[PDB]
Design a protein around this motif. Structure first.
Motif, PDB file in Angstrom:
ATOM      1  N   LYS B 633       0.780  -1.081   0.058  1.00  0.00           N
ATOM      2  CA  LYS B 633       0.115  -0.043   0.087  1.00  0.00           C
ATOM      3  C   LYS B 633       0.975   1.198  -0.157  1.00  0.00           C
ATOM      4  N   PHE B 634       1.969   1.407   0.890  1.00  0.00           N
ATOM      5  CA  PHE B 634       2.803   2.222   0.769  1.00  0.00           C
ATOM      6  C   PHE B 634       3.736   2.299  -0.586  1.00  0.00           C
ATOM      7  N   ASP B 635       3.875   1.093  -1.231  1.00  0.00           N
ATOM      8  CA  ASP B 635       4.289   1.252  -2.398  1.00  0.00           C
ATOM      9  C   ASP B 635       3.664   1.926  -3.553  1.00  0.00           C
ATOM     10  N   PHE B 637       1.556   4.330  -2.671  1.00  0.00           N
ATOM     11  CA  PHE B 637       1.856   5.684  -2.248  1.00  0.00           C
ATOM     12  C   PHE B 637       3.057   6.304  -2.749  1.00  0.00           C
ATOM     13  N   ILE B 638       4.122   5.350  -3.036  1.00  0.00           N
ATOM     14  CA  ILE B 638       5.134   5.634  -3.870  1.00  0.00           C
ATOM     15  C   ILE B 638       5.067   6.055  -5.348  1.00  0.00           C
ATOM     16  N   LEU B 639       4.045   5.374  -5.834  1.00  0.00           N
ATOM     17  CA  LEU B 639       3.890   5.881  -7.181  1.00  0.00           C
ATOM     18  C   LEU B 639       3.087   6.944  -7.204  1.00  0.00           C
ATOM     19  N   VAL B 640       2.075   7.138  -6.344  1.00  0.00           N
ATOM     20  CA  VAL B 640       1.471   8.522  -6.103  1.00  0.00           C
ATOM     21  C   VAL B 640       2.162   9.665  -6.141  1.00  0.00           C
ATOM     22  N   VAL B 641       3.260   9.665  -5.430  1.00  0.00           N
ATOM     23  CA  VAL B 641       3.940  10.704  -4.973  1.00  0.00           C
ATOM     24  C   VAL B 641       4.959  10.778  -6.114  1.00  0.00           C
ATOM     25  N   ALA B 642       5.334   9.964  -6.611  1.00  0.00           N
ATOM     26  CA  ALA B 642       6.260  10.035  -8.040  1.00  0.00           C
ATOM     27  C   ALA B 642       5.555  10.574  -9.146  1.00  0.00           C
ATOM     28  N   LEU B 643       4.502  10.176  -9.246  1.00  0.00           N
ATOM     29  CA  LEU B 643       3.664  10.645 -10.467  1.00  0.00           C
ATOM     30  C   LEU B 643       3.553  12.278 -10.166  1.00  0.00           C
ATOM     31  N   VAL B 644       3.080  12.578  -8.852  1.00  0.00           N
ATOM     32  CA  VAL B 644       2.732  13.921  -8.507  1.00  0.00           C
ATOM     33  C   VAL B 644       3.986  14.964  -8.677  1.00  0.00           C
ATOM     34  N   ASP B 645       4.863  14.472  -8.453  1.00  0.00           N
ATOM     35  CA  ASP B 645       6.307  15.137  -8.441  1.00  0.00           C
ATOM     36  C   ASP B 645       6.787  15.298 -10.091  1.00  0.00           C
ATOM     37  N   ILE B 646       6.461  14.228 -10.828  1.00  0.00           N
ATOM     38  CA  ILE B 646       6.827  14.319 -12.065  1.00  0.00           C
ATOM     39  C   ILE B 646       6.021  15.426 -12.877  1.00  0.00           C
ATOM     40  N   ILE B 647       4.754  15.400 -12.395  1.00  0.00           N
ATOM     41  CA  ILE B 647       4.050  16.475 -13.126  1.00  0.00           C
ATOM     42  C   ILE B 647       4.259  17.687 -12.989  1.00  0.00           C
ATOM     43  N   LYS B 649       7.164  25.314  -2.541  1.00  0.00           N
ATOM     44  CA  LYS B 649       7.240  24.362  -3.623  1.00  0.00           C
ATOM     45  C   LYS B 649       8.195  23.252  -3.117  1.00  0.00           C
ATOM     46  N   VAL B 650       9.661  23.669  -2.852  1.00  0.00           N
ATOM     47  CA  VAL B 650      10.676  22.726  -2.573  1.00  0.00           C
ATOM     48  C   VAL B 650      10.381  21.865  -1.405  1.00  0.00           C
ATOM     49  N   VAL B 651       9.835  22.462  -0.275  1.00  0.00           N
ATOM     50  CA  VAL B 651       9.438  21.810   0.917  1.00  0.00           C
ATOM     51  C   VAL B 651       8.300  20.577   0.691  1.00  0.00           C
ATOM     52  N   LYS B 652       7.184  20.951  -0.292  1.00  0.00           N
ATOM     53  CA  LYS B 652       6.292  20.189  -0.481  1.00  0.00           C
ATOM     54  C   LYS B 652       6.937  18.580  -1.009  1.00  0.00           C
ATOM     55  N   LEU B 653       8.195  18.715  -1.712  1.00  0.00           N
ATOM     56  CA  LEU B 653       8.964  17.797  -2.279  1.00  0.00           C
ATOM     57  C   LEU B 653       9.734  17.125  -1.626  1.00  0.00           C
ATOM     58  N   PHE B 654      10.605  17.990  -0.603  1.00  0.00           N
ATOM     59  CA  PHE B 654      11.285  17.315   0.451  1.00  0.00           C
ATOM     60  C   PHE B 654      10.609  16.392   1.654  1.00  0.00           C
ATOM     61  N   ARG B 655       9.649  17.121   2.046  1.00  0.00           N
ATOM     62  CA  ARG B 655       8.985  16.351   3.215  1.00  0.00           C
ATOM     63  C   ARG B 655       8.354  14.855   2.805  1.00  0.00           C
ATOM     64  N   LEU B 656       7.775  14.947   1.545  1.00  0.00           N
ATOM     65  CA  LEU B 656       7.340  13.586   1.003  1.00  0.00           C
ATOM     66  C   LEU B 656       8.669  12.552   0.866  1.00  0.00           C
ATOM     67  N   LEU B 657       9.587  13.263   0.016  1.00  0.00           N
ATOM     68  CA  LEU B 657      10.763  12.157  -0.253  1.00  0.00           C
ATOM     69  C   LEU B 657      11.466  11.907   0.759  1.00  0.00           C
ATOM     70  N   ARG B 658      11.753  12.502   2.072  1.00  0.00           N
ATOM     71  CA  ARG B 658      12.455  12.195   3.000  1.00  0.00           C
ATOM     72  C   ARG B 658      11.982  11.151   3.841  1.00  0.00           C
ATOM     73  N   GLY B 659      10.474  10.703   3.556  1.00  0.00           N
ATOM     74  CA  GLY B 659       9.686   9.512   4.177  1.00  0.00           C
ATOM     75  C   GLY B 659       9.680   8.278   3.310  1.00  0.00           C
ATOM     76  N   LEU B 660       9.334   8.595   2.141  1.00  0.00           N
ATOM     77  CA  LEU B 660       9.014   7.538   1.206  1.00  0.00           C
ATOM     78  C   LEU B 660      10.121   6.377   1.410  1.00  0.00           C
ATOM     79  N   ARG B 661      11.400   6.517   1.106  1.00  0.00           N
ATOM     80  CA  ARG B 661      12.361   5.583   1.050  1.00  0.00           C
ATOM     81  C   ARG B 661      12.828   5.218   2.309  1.00  0.00           C
ATOM     82  N   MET B 662      13.107   6.015   3.247  1.00  0.00           N
ATOM     83  CA  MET B 662      13.335   5.483   4.603  1.00  0.00           C
ATOM     84  C   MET B 662      12.653   4.295   4.855  1.00  0.00           C
TER      85      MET B 662
END
Lengths: 1022, 1022
Positions: B633-635, B637-647, B649-662
């Motif tokens: 399920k979190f996997d 969410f990984i695609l959800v965030v990846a698609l959102v950031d592909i499409i 402002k900097v904090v909105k990216l930092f906060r999600l990416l700092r959690g995903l892969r940890m």
């Protein structure tokens, strides 16, 4: 901010060396080249990144005069400290010819090459520096390979010793030639050059010898302090180099070389627990030095050297690598005819190994780094480092890698069949032991459910090596099987401390040599070289003993003249006056002050008065007999000169005073020379006793073994004849050595006795510690008191005056501990004297009395020989029947004689304490019981020492208390018969007198007829 | 000219320390004060002589930031490396209270004294520096005295541990207060102070812990390379301090303290030959540091300090020495009520020892030297050094000298009667051994003429210490004699490798404690604390095992989804992406460059695509079952965030990416946590097995011993009752531990099995090396292969999955090695299951079949318990008569059942190889034969392990080949009877079935009637 950044680089190199040494372990490439690549990487990144430059600068660009003073002592001493010195001495000439003369030719030939081939247009000085750093070799890997492959002794030590000497002299030459390039001097007077040569070549070894003999002296007096031993070794090593090179201008490297070699030889003065520590300690320091040097090279070579290369330089590198290789081979072959005569000699294959294994390394690189710092902007430092580094790389990439395959090609790496057999047997026994252990554990309630599939796989050990014509090789089997047995016995004696390692290796070397020679058995005449004393030392002892022959002369002044305190104080007074003697000359030299000269000359007058006073006391003591001794005649000359100089140009005083007191000190010096000479004889004599002991005990044990191993009696008789013909010759030789040097022999014998007592005493400590009746701490406390005594054993005087005969009787086994009995027989005793070749007793003679040898040798004929301390007649007096053997003296003899009639009275009067007759019987029982038990288990793992101790615990049965002796095995393990005969309880068969009682025997019925008193020996089980 | 003069001073101090340590050895004064006087002498002469100043300057005036970085790591690590950590942990709280809180009060009280008493008008910062350097103590001498005197464990470690912690924290405080005097900072914001505290107090120990766990990891993987082990230890020690203090601003001293303690705890990862080397190595380095520091003090104190003294300063010195002494005592007494509850508690006399033994030394002096350099011309550096040096001198002159007499006064130095008895017995046995050895040597032909008067004197060892009322103390004799016997057995097991040192010391501690308590015997409930697992680790194991419960889910995509290579590569891909994650944030921070940001964001797009691809493969593999797991399920969410950031402002990216892969890496992290938890349980569980083993074997052996040592049966029965009531409780507890943690128990059992096989395998190597059938080099080669395996044993997995029952049968002792026989009974076998408390069989039951325990425990009633792997019925099937004991399950049980009828067919069909019946009889024979032989020699030096091996070599006689069995003792050493009865050949008397055959027995006549088949066991002599 102000931190020691060097801690990073040092510790970083540690990690990098660990990584490279761990990865490239099973690979053929050595780890050192990996370190060079890593250093080069550090160099390129550090060339752009500033941060890492700061942590590499302080070490990569370290001063040369610190590089030499710190690393070279470690490398050179470690190389020296790792030597097998005894072997290195037995090949010293062979090494010196190759290492010294071979070095000169190898370097000069390398130099002419550099003058003519290269375009650098070097002059002879620089080219000689080049050749010096090219000739330095560190064959740490090749020697390891040979050590692993076997047959290394006659080759590994040669390459190791040649390497040591080659580096030592190469640094000397490099130091010499660096000074005529970077520190040129213009004086260049020939006379000083000879003086200059003497310092580096002669004084260096002498400086190291003096420091070594001082060092071992203190080390021999340090007890129960390991830290101080280690610390002393370190400070001595570094001070020797520092003082020699900096203060005395003496060659430090050679001083350390001698110091390391001398200390390695005198390791006995060091506690064993510290000895093992030091090897691993200096090895670690050398490892650090090597790892550092390679990384500093990798750094600087990339920063400064490789940036100034030209295209053709590589052509010279390849040509140079080929040249030094053929140069080394040509040198080795050229000297080969000489080496064939001097030393072991070189085979063509062994020559190639030396030629191929001439690896370069740290020492060459360290000296190249020195040039790089010293050349500054000059190209020479770059190309010196370039070619040195390249040759190191090539030798490591090619020679270090192909050496194993070349050894395979030459047939040298092949494992000999005996070693394959030993490995197969060892693996098999180990495999069976594990199987036994495995079944035991499967029956354990605690471990019943362990995964045995994992266990068995994890603990398995695997083999790492995976008619006339009949007589012509049946004898070879007899030779090899006998020789193999001899080798086993020598290892037995070494492991129980009865035999030193040097004697063991000598015996093993001779056995191996005899094996290869087709028709050879080990020959005593080859062994004789061990104990044959070179005549210089006996001649010196005899000569110097005359110079103190006071017997030409030997009222309170008479007493004072002979009192030791007066003599010691007078000698000290002379010793102190030496300080004024040199001080006056130095003061005059510096002045050329008056306030100092007046004080010295007043002191001279005072010392003249003192010298007059002591001489007056001596003359009053001896009167007209004073001048009988030439020593006192010069003592009169002392007063003559003192009075002359009191009355009264400077040279007239210097010349006389410089001689007076040096000569008067020579008198106190001579005895120390006597002691030193005794020490040298003691060392050589002790080794002779050990080797003769090893061969005698070896033959005695082997004769028990071969008696049932070889199948043919004719082969058996030939082999046994050799054994006895060698044994008796050795016994005679060793007995005669005693008469030539009585006191030194006594010192040797005493030292062995104490060492044997302490060893067995130490063993008991581990017995109860292993049995838990004594704790770990307290057992350790006792063991130290044992250890300190063992060290005190080394400092025992080299000569002990032989005790007089009145003391010999007191120490006899059956007399000791009973003063009244000692006095009785001592009073009844008489001392005889016999001339050379005289017969003492003969076959069939009545036993009228007993003999004890107090001096000389006696031959018997079952031939044998005996010497001092041995009693003769210990059976005839007991059995009371004719004598059993002839007694002929091989030299003048003295003996204590007790008439049988008086001894019989002593026998039938001294019986309160354990019976005198019981004791005499006991001495006989052990003497003839030992061979029987040795025969019964010599083929097993026991030595005759433990057979004696096995018997020593036993005693003679009190047969008077029973008509019969019934066996038991719970508290009794062995029994032997000595005298009389017994009747078997079951079979009624008789058992002969000198016979072991078979374990099928139960109960023995004796009889009390007057013809004999039966005697039986038992040893109770533990 | 450019030489490293420091080599002189370092090596000179070496010689001076050797001299002072050699002269003042037997004197009461410590050698350190002598070194201070020598340094003062050097100072006065160097103040006028210029030559020696140059050789003392570079070290006497060495920079402080190098003094700390070089010496303190050596001193602190050596103090830590020398600890008895296990004891230090068992008193950690008691030390922490005294060392940390006691330090604060001791220093502050010392500071107020310095503010008020002295005229220097110090401020609190300087006074706190004063108190810090005053509180530092190095009781290296007092601890040595206690170690020698005994009863040291509960006091020496406390003073040693208190000292270590006190120096560690004192440096921390000194570092803190030096900066507010010499490096004042003005910010002083409160929030940073808390952050500042966290670094020094919390991060330091964590930094050391991380470095230690990394270090031991590599050390556990280094095989057959000692140099690398030593080098790794050195580099880790110095880098830990250097990196922590210089790069991380973390407390270096505490990091080293933890690092030394952790390494000391994990010494098993180090090769034993290196362990012994390291202690002596670090001890030597600490010795050098101490000797240097004292001499630098002696130099500077004379040059700079003593020249600025005032008359009253001495008054303050004496008052100060008194003050710190009463301050320390007041602190110790003040906390004494707390300590009485926490830890062992302090007696008033022990308190004084701690108060009196508070010696100062190098650490205090080193910190004073730092102030002297830093103060420059200020008087404070002079008086800091003056008072520090004076207090060191006084404590060394007074406290270090009178401490022995004070210990005598307090009655603590008295040697306990048991130790006096042990020493007297040990000396006596040693004295007898030498006398035996002396007589043996006097019979030697080689050594007959040694001066025995010298020998006997030199080898002698001397004692260094030179009715109801009856029942009320007869029991005390029984207690003490039993307790003494227990202590012996524990030492036995340790010396043969069956028992670890930690278990041995625990057992010995409990025995000693029980001895002092008047009515006490060793109590299992006290032992239970060893193996009772703390619930945190089992709870963590149970919890984490759920997080990876893939069983909720567990065409090529389906295969790829489960393939390990794909999972590992995906995890690695996430691992690499972490570098971009931090790199983007750091780049943004430094920019606040664009060329770098664009590259990172392009990399982000690429990684988004890769994450999409792998998730697509997973979904294709599992289809609609993909989302069943919350991890997937979190996997999503990984695609959800990846698609959102592909499409986008900097904090909105930092906060999600700092959690995903940890979070996505936590999945791969959990199994390692499981392994670590298993390791902690394995360590605690292993110690429990050892201690329970030690007590069980100890009681089994002691019961044989006491049965004949204590005189009264009533006393005997009470003691034996205690033994069994403890033994059965321990057996039950240890059997139950297995069921809670099956795999870890299997790992423990396997590790013991391998270790035991290798130990005995190693012993054989020394047997032939001592027997000479294998040479020194080759024997060493094999021994290394053994050693590396022992190290590989440590890295065995902490948990081994328990083998299935089909594998248990294969490994049974009487089934192993015969596949056809294994298959036959395996096919005939059936598996049963039983509920809690169920009876399996009962007294008098017919033996219809055989059981093997594959799971659970069973109680029997001569009560006993059994568990997995134990076979039941091995006699009833053989004797073919009713069952002998009850069998009740203490938990749910599974057993392999073989019906007697089928087994009988197997018995009478499988006889080609060694008979099946022979094997089953053999298993029985060893089981019941061991107690008999143990009874027969338990009072001797043997352990039951060697009795089993002694029997393991034996076998059952083939009685079918003879009507009788006649004894022999040459090739046979022990025999036991098992089944049937025999008739004596001589006396015609019968010998009972489970009876050892007395050594008075000869020949046994059997009979072949059908009632029984007699069975007899023999062990052939070596």
């Amino acid at each position: 901010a102000h931190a020691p950044k060097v801690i990073v680089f040092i510790s970083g190199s540690c990690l990098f060396g660990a990584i490279s040494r761990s990865l490239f372990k099973k690979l053929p490439i050595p780890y050192t080249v990996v370190l060079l690549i890593l250093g080069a990487i550090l160099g390129v990144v550090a060339s752009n990144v500033p941060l890492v430059e700061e942590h590499t600068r302080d070490v990569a660009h370290m001063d040369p005069h610190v590089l030499l003073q710190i690393f070279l002592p470690v490398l050179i001493f470690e190389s020296a400290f790792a030597m097998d010195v005894h072997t290195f001495m037995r090949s010293f000439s062979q090494v010196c010819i190759l290492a010294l003369f071979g070095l000169v030719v190898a370097s000069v030939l390398t130099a002419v090459l550099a003058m003519n081939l290269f375009n650098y247009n070097w002059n002879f000085s620089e080219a000689m520096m080049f050749g010096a750093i090219m000739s330095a070799t560190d064959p740490v890997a090749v020697v390891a390979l040979l050590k692993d492959l076997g047959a290394s002794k006659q080759l590994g030590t040669i390459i190791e010793g040649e390497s040591l000497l080659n580096d030592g002299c190469a640094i000397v030459i490099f130091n010499v030639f660096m000074k005529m390039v970077f520190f040129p001097q213009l004086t260049s007077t020939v006379g000083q050059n000879v003086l200059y040569f003497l310092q580096v070549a002669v004084a260096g070894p002498l400086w190291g010898y003096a420091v070594a003999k001082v060092t071992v002296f203190f080390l021999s007096h340090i007890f129960n302090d390991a830290l101080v031993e280690i610390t002393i070794t370190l400070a001595a090593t570094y001070l020797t180099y520092y003082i020699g090179d900096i203060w005395l201008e003496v060659s430090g490297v050679l001083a350390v070389v001698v110091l390391g070699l001398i200390v390695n030889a005198e390791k006995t003065s060091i506690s064993p627990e510290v000895e093992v520590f030091l090897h691993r300690f200096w090895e670690m320091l050398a490892y650090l030095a090597n790892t550092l040097i390679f990384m500093m090279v990798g750094v600087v070579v990339t920063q400064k050297a490789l940036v100034a290369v030209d295209k053709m330089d590589w052509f010279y590198l390849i040509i140079l690598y080929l040249a030094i290789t053929i140069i080394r081979g040509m040198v080795i072959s050229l000297f080969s005819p000489i080496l064939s005569r001097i030393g072991y000699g070189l085979t063509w294959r062994n020559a190639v190994i030396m030629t191929w294994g001439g690896l370069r390394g740290a020492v060459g690189l360290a000296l190249a780094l020195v040039v790089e710092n010293l050349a500054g902007n000059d190209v020479i430092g770059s190309k010196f480092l370039f070619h040195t580094a390249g040759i190191v790389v090539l030798t490591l990439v090619i020679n270090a890698t192909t050496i194993q395959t070349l050894l395979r090609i030459l047939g040298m790496s092949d494992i000999s069949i005996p070693k394959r057999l030993a490995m197969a047997g060892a693996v098999r026994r180990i495999h069976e032991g594990q199987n036994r252990t495995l079944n035991m554990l499967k029956s354990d309630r605690f471990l019943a459910d362990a995964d045995w599939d994992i266990a068995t796989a994890a603990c398995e050990i695997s083999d790492p090596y995976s008619s006339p014509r009949e007589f012509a090789d049946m004898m070879e089997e007899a030779r090899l099987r006998m020789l193999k047995a001899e080798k086993i016995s020598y290892w037995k004696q070494f492991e129980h401390g009865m035999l030193a390692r040097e004697a063991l290796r000598l015996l093993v070397q001779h056995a191996e040599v005899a094996a290869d020679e087709k028709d050879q058995f080990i020959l005593v005449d080859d062994l004789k070289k061990s104990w044959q004393i070179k005549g210089i030392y006996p001649w010196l002892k005899r000569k110097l003993e005359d110079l103190i022959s006071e017997k030409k002369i030997a009222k309170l002044m008479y007493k004072i003249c002979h009192h030791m305190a007066f003599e010691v104080t007078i000698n000290i007074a002379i010793v102190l006056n030496i300080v004024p003697i040199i001080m006056e000359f130095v003061v005059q030299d510096k002045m050329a002050l008056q306030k100092i000269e007046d004080a010295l000359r007043i002191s001279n007058y005072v010392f003249f008065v003192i010298y007059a006073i002591e001489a007056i006391v001596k003359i009053l003591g001896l009167g007209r007999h004073y001048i009988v001794s030439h020593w006192n005649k010069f003592d009169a000359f002392i007063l003559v000169v003192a009075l002359v100089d009191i009355i009264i140009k400077v040279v007239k005083l210097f010349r006389l005073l410089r001689g007076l007191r040096m000569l008067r000190l020579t008198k106190a010096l001579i005895p120390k020379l006597i002691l030193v000479v005794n020490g040298k004889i003691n060392n050589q004599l002790s080794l002779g006793y050990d080797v003769g002991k090893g061969y005698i005990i070896g033959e005695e044990e082997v004769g028990k073994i071969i008696d049932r191993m070889v199948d043919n009696k004719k082969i058996l008789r030939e082999l046994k004849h050799i054994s006895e013909t060698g044994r008796l010759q050795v016994v005679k030789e060793l007995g005669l050595l005693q008469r030539e040097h009585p006191g030194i022999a006594v010192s040797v014998k005493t030292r062995q006795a104490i060492r044997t007592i302490l060893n067995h005493s130490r063993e008991t400590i581990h017995e109860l510690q292993g049995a838990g009746l004594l704790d770990e701490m307290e057992a350790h406390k006792l063991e130290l008191t044992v250890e300190i005594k063992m060290k005190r054993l080394m400092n025992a005087p080299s000569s002990i005056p032989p005790p007089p005969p009145e003391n010999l009787l007191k120490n006899v086994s059956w007399l000791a501990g009973d003063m009244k009995l000692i006095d009785f027989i001592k009073a009844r005793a008489s001392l005889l004297h016999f001339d050379y070749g005289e017969v003492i007793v003969r076959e069939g003679d009545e036993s009228d009395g007993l003999f004890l040898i107090v001096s000389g040798l006696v031959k018997l004929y079952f031939e044998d020989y005996l010497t001092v301390g041995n009693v003769i007649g210990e059976m005839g007096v007991l059995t009371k029947k004719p004598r059993n053997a002839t007694v002929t003296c091989e030299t003048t003899v003295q003996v204590y004689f007790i008439t049988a009639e008086d001894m019989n009275i002593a026998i039938d009067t001294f019986t309160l304490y354990p019976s005198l007759e019981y004791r005499l019987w006991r001495v006989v029982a052990i003497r003839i019981a030992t061979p029987l038990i040795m025969e019964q288990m010599a083929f097993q793992g026991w030595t005759q020492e433990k057979v004696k101790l096995h018997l020593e615990r036993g005693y003679l049965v009190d047969l008077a208390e029973s008509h019969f002796q019934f066996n038991i095995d719970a508290t009794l393990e062995d029994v032997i018969l000595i005298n009389g005969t017994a009747y078997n309880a079951h079979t009624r068969e008789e058992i002969r007198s000198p016979c072991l009682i078979s374990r099928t025997v139960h109960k023995l019925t004796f009889q009390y007829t007057a013809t004999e008193e039966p005697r039986l020996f038992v040893v109770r089980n533990a």
